[PDB]
Amino acid sequence: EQKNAGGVGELEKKAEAGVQGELAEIKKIAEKKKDDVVKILIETVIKPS
Amino acid sequence: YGAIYSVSGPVVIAENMIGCAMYELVKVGHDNLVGEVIRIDGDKATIQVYEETAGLTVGDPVLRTGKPLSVELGPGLMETIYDGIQRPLKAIKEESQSIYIPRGIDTPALDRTIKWQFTPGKFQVGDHISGGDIYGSVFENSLISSHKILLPPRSRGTITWIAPAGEYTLDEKILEVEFDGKKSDFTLYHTWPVRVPRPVTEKLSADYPLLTGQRVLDALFPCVQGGTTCIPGAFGCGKTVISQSLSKYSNSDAIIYVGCGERGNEMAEVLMEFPELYTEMSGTKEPIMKRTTLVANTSNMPVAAREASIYTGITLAEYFRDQGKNVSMIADSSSRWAEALREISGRLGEMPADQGFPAYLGAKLASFYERAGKAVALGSPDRTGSVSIVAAVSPAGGDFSDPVTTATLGITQVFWGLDKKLAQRKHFPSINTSVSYSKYTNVLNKFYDSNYPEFPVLRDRMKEILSNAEELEQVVQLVGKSALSDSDKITLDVATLIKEDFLQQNGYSTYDAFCPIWKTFDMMRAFISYHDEAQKAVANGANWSKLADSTGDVKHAVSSSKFFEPSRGEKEVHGEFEKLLSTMQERFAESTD
Amino acid sequence: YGAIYSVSGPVVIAENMIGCAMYELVKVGHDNLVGEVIRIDGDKATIQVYEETAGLTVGDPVLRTGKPLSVELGPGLMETIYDGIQRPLKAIKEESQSIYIPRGIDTPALDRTIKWQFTPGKFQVGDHISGGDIYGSVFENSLISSHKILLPPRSRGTITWIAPAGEYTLDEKILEVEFDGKKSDFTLYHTWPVRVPRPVTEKLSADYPLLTGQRVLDALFPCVQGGTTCIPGAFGCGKTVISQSLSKYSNSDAIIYVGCGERGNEMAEVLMEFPELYTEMSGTKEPIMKRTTLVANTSNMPVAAREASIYTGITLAEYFRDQGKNVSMIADSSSRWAEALREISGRLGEMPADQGFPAYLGAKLASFYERAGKAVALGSPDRTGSVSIVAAVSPAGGDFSDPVTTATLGITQVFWGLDKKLAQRKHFPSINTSVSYSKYTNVLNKFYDSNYPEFPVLRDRMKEILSNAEELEQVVQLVGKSALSDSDKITLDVATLIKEDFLQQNGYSTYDAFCPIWKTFDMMRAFISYHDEAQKAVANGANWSKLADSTGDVKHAVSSSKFFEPSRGEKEVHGEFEKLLSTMQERFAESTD
Amino acid sequence: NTVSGVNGPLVILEKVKFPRYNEIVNLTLPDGTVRQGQVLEIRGDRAIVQVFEGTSGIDVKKTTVEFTGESLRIPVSEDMLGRIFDGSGRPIDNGPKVFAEDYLDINGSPINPYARIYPEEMISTGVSAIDTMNSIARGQKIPIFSASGLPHNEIAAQICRQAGLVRPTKDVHDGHEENFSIVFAAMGVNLETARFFKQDFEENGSLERTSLFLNLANDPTIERIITPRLALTTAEYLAYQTERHVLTILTDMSSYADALREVSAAREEVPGRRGYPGYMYTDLSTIYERAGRVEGRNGSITQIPILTMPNDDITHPIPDLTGYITEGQIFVDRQLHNKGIYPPINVLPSLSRLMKSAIGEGMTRKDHGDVSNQLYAKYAIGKDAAAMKAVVGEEALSIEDKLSLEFLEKFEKTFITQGAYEDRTVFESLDQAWSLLRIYPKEMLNRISPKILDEFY
Amino acid sequence: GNFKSKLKKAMLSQQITKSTIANKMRLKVLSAREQSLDGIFEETKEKLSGIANNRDEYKPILQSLIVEALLKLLEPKAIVKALERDVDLIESMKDDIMREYGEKAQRAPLEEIVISNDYLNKDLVSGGVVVSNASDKIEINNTLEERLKLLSEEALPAIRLELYG
């Protein structure tokens, strides 16, 4: 049980550390390809589909 | 609005019906009979009219009510006898000089003569309030929890007008809600279409029992609120008794009784008996009836009301579940609700499936079971309430191999086998340990072990002992009882006490058919301690005759156990059992040596 | 050309059809799905499109091919795998990267990629030729030319141009025919509509041995060359199992396997297993497969492929018979073919008969069986061939009275059973004698007597033993083994032994090995011998126990004999069977006195 | 356009003729709620739709129709495990979203590539009665035939949970080299059931292991039929693209069949035997065809459908049809359940005709198949003897019968009796099975080849 | 006995947390993956309104949105519901549409485009038009949000291949 009273601390520490780096790269790689996708989306709309 | 194209039987088709929904409540003719649109082909709407379409020429007007057929949920349900689509039978008795409702007589679902005292909640104007949050309450009961008024599900907004404390009528507005201009006014009741399930915060599995107050239910295989259960039919020489007793002995907060399509002798008995009988927990003001809300249909009532009967009852049960209460839905019988489907199908021209019963049957049962169950009630501080369905399924082919029974048992997790021969001799209830099962056993037995009883040990052992007894009885017939050991004789001796005290209870006496869930556990404790000790003692050098003379007084007490009072100091610990345990240990040294 | 008017289910209605034959093949929509014209209502022709439709638009194009759903008969049918709508399955894998048919593929009927070696016939320039004549031949196998190039039926003339010896492709011309100028060129393949049977010279009596190589058939009710057979049974019946054995052992020069709507894994197994295993008359590279062609179709693969399976396959068979080959056609199952019809009758809205299957069922099965039989090949060289049809069906829950099984039984002259109880103990296939008959049994025994075995004399006693065994078993059940006589005990034992050693084809090491009519005969000499000597012995005074324990070794030996490979002295009479005969003789004598 | 009428689950649209078969349309209610449906029948200037969601409230000129202009395909991703979905092509649970890298059709042939090579790899459930007597393979289809007095959900969960622990023990043995994935789909079962299942998967392992599709009984019959189709798309992608073995647990299969039955009753479609459709064969097939090894031949979809029989008969249309199609039959018995056997699997009619495909020999014994046949045969005789013991008594039964009555009792109580978490390896099971055979003498074990009996006894 | 059940119970609570950590991560990831997609989608309909509000650049786009819808419409009269700013733009190019339709059909030229007195919102629609039936039964919503959203169905796997492939 002590691995389950101290495991509620670990309930967020390992959840946060688990994607601490991944949420920084998702938001990083988005800001690059943002503009590049937006031009494609604009293009599809002003082209009759 | 529309004009009648045809009346062919009780089915009436009408043209010039636009924006007509597919559950739309409509009133047909000048007379204003109740009807509902099952189907639409083109411009023409095909209506089943539940009342006689006699005197209705083609060309009469059809007036939309402008909304589906709904049921009203709010104050003044309890102590009222109703139709399958909720129409007070009681109110017709006052006006019409009729029990039943005759054609061309409709009335509102809730009485508007009655006024109830509305008390505001914890929300005031300018507060945002959300779906199901407790806006107020009405108190009109003192024996049970009353009608706590919720903001209508799937409705949100900021409250422009919250009426202050005082008496208002059910009809009259007490709320206006601001959500994109004036959202509408709302009243003390809410309308909800009954062929739509009511939402709740979330649904959960059941785990939580309550006082059933019939010993055999708890003891043989526990009775749970938020359960799914099948009980066999008998057509009022056995069916009626168990239903009347379940309503009376169970001290569940509400009970909602639904007679789907009954004889009419059974409907007549439940209404007269409820004020007459006494609560098992104390209080007057028409004891059991005050806790009861009744939907009572004989087979003579319109067929749509018979089909509708369970749906309206289930919505009722679901409404009280959001207040936080434990409800018993006792429905009798699904075979009779099913009979309605069959009739309605042939009238439309629908092609059914097996034995003439439609195919809408199996899915409608599955949908029905899931509305019932345990849930955390909706409303801001949250409570727990339950809806437990015990549905009888009678003969519908003279066997139990017919589509209605076979479909239900499958979804159901519990079967309780009434015994006919014992029932004809008027022991009620008298459940057979052979046919019966509960798949709820495991989770529940763990729940009672938590609470204080030794329940898992005793229940399991109860079953084994009886099963074992049939097998040993056969060895007595064919070989003889004399060549068999003392141990085996004992296995039978104990089974007979378990059979006599629990199983053969008489619901015509309250010192023989009403005892609390703890009390029922204490009796069962008593018999098990004796079995082990009796087998232990015969091994160490005793005989059946010797054993019987020696146990004496403790054996006599266990035999006399049912006659004892629900209390002795508390109704949870019965002092006479706790001291009985000592007298048994002292007796065992003496007997054995 | 035509334009889709409607798609209601798999049924499509298209206007602007001035014509079209019956069951005309079409390519529907831009997708190019399979269809056939069943009916015509006005100008709108109702065409069922049988390849799965989830995305066909109304007013998509409709292309008539101009001829009915047909098959190509020509070179490269052997060791080449096809569907029931004659698409090569191998061609699809490569192109499509869809191992099975995906929605919307149009792959031509044969392989136009594999060059074949053509040599010229006894018909040179200026010579008359007529349908079914051997115009030439194509090398396909390592041991024999499979596909004898026939002039098609309904063509005739004198040959102006005979191509010389060399390699050519399938679409290139190789034959020119004179009759009213250039009647046309001919190519290596020829076409034929599969709803027309191929015409023969004459049909000939069926009385010539068909060795299927399975002990259990040979022993009880053999088939004939020219045969028709029904076999019922439902999963665990060993029908896949008996197909594989059947293909390996079969004396016929072609076997055509028809998968009517199979598991897919079952088709995957038999395909792999023919080149993994070796043939009994030898086979160089893909041994068994060299003689095997598969029509395979799975359970959701096109309803046309499944419906056409029996006709595509029977047409193949008739063409091999016109070539001068003996064909054993296995179809599995005609019952899955029957489901294709049940589905067709609903979609169209034609009225069906009993069990929701149409009435046209009975004609369609009958037409298939009548084209089977033994015949003298059409064409001038003249040869003898057969098509012996073994057709699998399935009971509806142990009910053998279902329309499909009854219909097939109507047409058949041989019936071979399948008993559920006996399959559970592992004896599948399970043929007795009260669920099976063969009209060929009488002539067939006369032909086997000639070849060497004593079979007819042993066949009669063998039938009797089984027939008495069943009746005697009913007394054991009810009365007990206390009402028996000693000779009746004997009938019970010998019977149990027969049940295991013929009917069971289940392994214990290895699936059982090729047992001929000769092998089968030896088993019968040893069982029948055991029974005679033992009954004499009991009649003449002797213990049951003495006799059964003494046979002992001999019983183990017959059980396991079939696992051991044939020839162990000879095929004819094995040394292992020869020696038992002496052992019985020695025992009989010890027992008597 | 606008709704013309509505007759049951069928909706009559008055429209224009441009729509294609199973093209999505969205019905806009006057509440402003949108519900989805697909056209089942199209005709000139009109349609019949079946709406997945709902079946009532549908108006006339106050309602509107809008075309999506894409026929239904399921959005499939391979990141689907651990993620909560609802049986409707999206989560209405508010669970993690589906995403799409392919959208794949449920018609029963998208690009379908299956078995040209039959299963040869053994996959174990940790349960002796399953594994030994019938065997399970990397494409095997085995129906769980259950009843209204058996608890179908407890056995369903039992087979799945114990096959997840055994399956990595088998990976190490080199029976496998690829991932295991579970796809669990529950269609139109009770709330009580749904909750239970999720709780079971968590205890044994986790819910990261499995993907969940949840469909509620209150949601229509039309929804229920699409629910397994969604499971099929999930499994085919995983096998095809990422060479994973996929295990599908399809509960309840009977639930799906009743749904078919409803759209021929409130249709003018004439039904076949016992009120079950004539085109019932095709509906069932669609699920079962999409099974076997998937192209690359390291991927697979293996099926365990779960059938609850309502009458418990073997003359009912659902159990019969399923059985001809499926590669095995597993029959679970009420009488064993009563007696106190868990799992309470009766092998008296459990049979596989594709018994060879089902067994393994390169990661299981060769002796596995030989022993199983003998066991089954000896169990059956032991049942014939049981009926005879009641009738005749022990007052005429033979020396041989007595051995067979003992075998029957030892066989139920040892082999079929296993703990709730106790998993048996297939090799250990043989040892157990050999204990069962060992009481019979060398003349009663006569049917078996001499080689095997002298080797292992 | 009851030791074994308390011994399992704590190992169960151990794996309920391993599972809840693992679920919070797929939830943080998924909702981050979407937050990015809904900011790409956000920028495109902001960019588009700026295109729409310079009338002369919107003029050939609008012509094409209508011609497109009209070929799915297949009626001689279309009722076009527009914003109060685009009714003036449609008016000044009705002939061009009916020309342009005619050249891309073989059905018949379009007879009329109907400028109705009912209009689309400007606080619910950013720009674009709803081209509808003769009796307003079926409509092709060639509004900026609706096009962007349907386009989202097909954009999502493309965006997924270039972003995580």
From Swiss-Prot, chain A:
Disulfide bonds: none
Remaining remarks: Present with 2280 molecules/cell in log phase SD medium.
Compartments in which it is found: Vacuole membrane
Protein name: V-type proton ATPase subunit G
Quaternary data: V-ATPase is a heteromultimeric enzyme composed of a peripheral catalytic V1 complex (components A to H) attached to an integral membrane V0 proton pore complex (components: a, c, c', c'', d, e, f and VOA1).
Protein task: Subunit of the V1 complex of vacuolar(H+)-ATPase (V-ATPase), a multisubunit enzyme composed of a peripheral complex (V1) that hydrolyzes ATP and a membrane integral complex (V0) that translocates protons. V-ATPase is responsible for acidifying and maintaining the pH of intracellular compartments.
Species assigned in the record: Saccharomyces cerevisiae (strain ATCC 204508 / S288c)
Family named by the database record: Belongs to the V-ATPase G subunit family.
Curated annotation (Swiss-Prot), chains B, C:
EC number: 7.1.2.2, 3.1.-.-
CC per GO annotation: fungal-type vacuole membrane; Golgi membrane; proton-transporting V-type ATPase complex; vacuolar proton-transporting V-type ATPase complex; vacuolar proton-transporting V-type ATPase, V1 domain
Range of residues in the leader sequence: none
Primary site of residence: membrane
Matching SMART domains: HintC, HintN
Subcellular location: Vacuole membrane
Annotated Pfam families: ATP-synt_ab, ATP-synt_ab_N, ATP-synt_ab_Xtn, ATP-synt_VA_C, Hom_end, Hom_end_hint
Reaction equation(s) it catalyzes: ATP + H2O + 4 H(+)(in) = ADP + phosphate + 5 H(+)(out)
Post-translational modification remark: This protein undergoes a protein self splicing that involves a post-translational excision of the VDE intervening region (intein) followed by peptide ligation.
Gene Ontology terms: biological process: ATP metabolic process; endosomal lumen acidification; Golgi lumen acidification; intein-mediated protein splicing; intron homing; proton transmembrane transport; vacuolar acidification
PROSITE patterns: ATPASE_ALPHA_BETA, INTEIN_C_TER, INTEIN_ENDONUCLEASE, INTEIN_N_TER
The protein's name in its UniProt record: V-type proton ATPase catalytic subunit A
Lineage: Eukaryota, Fungi, Dikarya, Ascomycota, Saccharomycotina
UniProtKB/Swiss-Prot annotation, chain D:
Keyword annotations of the record: ATP-binding, Hydrogen ion transport, Ion transport, Isopeptide bond, Membrane, Nucleotide-binding, Phosphoprotein, Transport, Ubl conjugation, Vacuole
Record carries keyword Phosphoprotein: yes
CDD domains to which the protein is assigned, alphabetical: ATP-synt_V_A-type_beta_C (cd18112), ATP-synt_V_A-type_beta_N (cd18118), V_A-ATPase_B (cd01135)
Phosphoserine carried by residues: S109
Gene3D superfamilies: 3.40.50.12240
One GO process term, biological-process aspect: proteasome storage granule assembly
UniProt topology in membrane: Peripheral membrane protein
Chain sites annotated for binding ATP: R353
GO molecular function list: ATP binding; proton-transporting ATPase activity, rotational mechanism
One Pfam family recorded for the sequence: ATP-synt_VA_C
Domain of life: Eukaryota
Family: Belongs to the ATPase alpha/beta chains family.
Subunit structure: V-ATPase is a heteromultimeric enzyme composed of a peripheral catalytic V1 complex (components A to H) attached to an integral membrane V0 proton pore complex (components: a, c, c', c'', d, e, f and VOA1). Interacts with RAV1 and RAV2 components of the RAVE complex, which are essential for the stability and assembly of V-ATPase.
Main function: Non-catalytic subunit of the V1 complex of vacuolar(H+)-ATPase (V-ATPase), a multisubunit enzyme composed of a peripheral complex (V1) that hydrolyzes ATP and a membrane integral complex (V0) that translocates protons. V-ATPase is responsible for acidifying and maintaining the pH of intracellular compartments.
Name assigned to this protein: V-type proton ATPase subunit B
Species this chain originates from: Saccharomyces cerevisiae (strain ATCC 204508 / S288c)
Lineage start: Eukaryota, Fungi, Dikarya, Ascomycota, Saccharomycotina
Swiss-Prot record, chain E:
GO cellular component annotations of the record: fungal-type vacuole membrane; Golgi membrane; membrane raft; proton-transporting V-type ATPase complex; vacuolar proton-transporting V-type ATPase complex; vacuolar proton-transporting V-type ATPase, V1 domain
Keyword Metal-binding recorded: no
GO biological process: one example: Golgi lumen acidification
One GO MF term: proton-transporting ATPase activity, rotational mechanism
Membrane topology: Peripheral membrane protein
Keyword Transport annotated: yes
Subcellular location: Vacuole membrane
Effect of Y101A: Reduces ATPase activity by 22%
Keywords carried by this UniProt record: Acetylation, Coiled coil, Hydrogen ion transport, Ion transport, Membrane, Transport, Vacuole
Its biological purpose: Subunit of the V1 complex of vacuolar(H+)-ATPase (V-ATPase), a multisubunit enzyme composed of a peripheral complex (V1) that hydrolyzes ATP and a membrane integral complex (V0) that translocates protons. V-ATPase is responsible for acidifying and maintaining the pH of intracellular compartments.
Oligomeric and partner information: Homodimer. V-ATPase is a heteromultimeric enzyme composed of a peripheral catalytic V1 complex (components A to H) attached to an integral membrane V0 proton pore complex (components: a, c, c', c'', d, e, f and VOA1). Interacts with VMA5; the interaction is direct. Interacts with VMA10; the interaction is direct. Interacts with RAV1 and RAV2 components of the RAVE complex, which are essential for the stability and assembly of V-ATPase.
Family membership: Belongs to the V-ATPase E subunit family.
Name of the gene encoding the protein in the UniProt record: VMA4
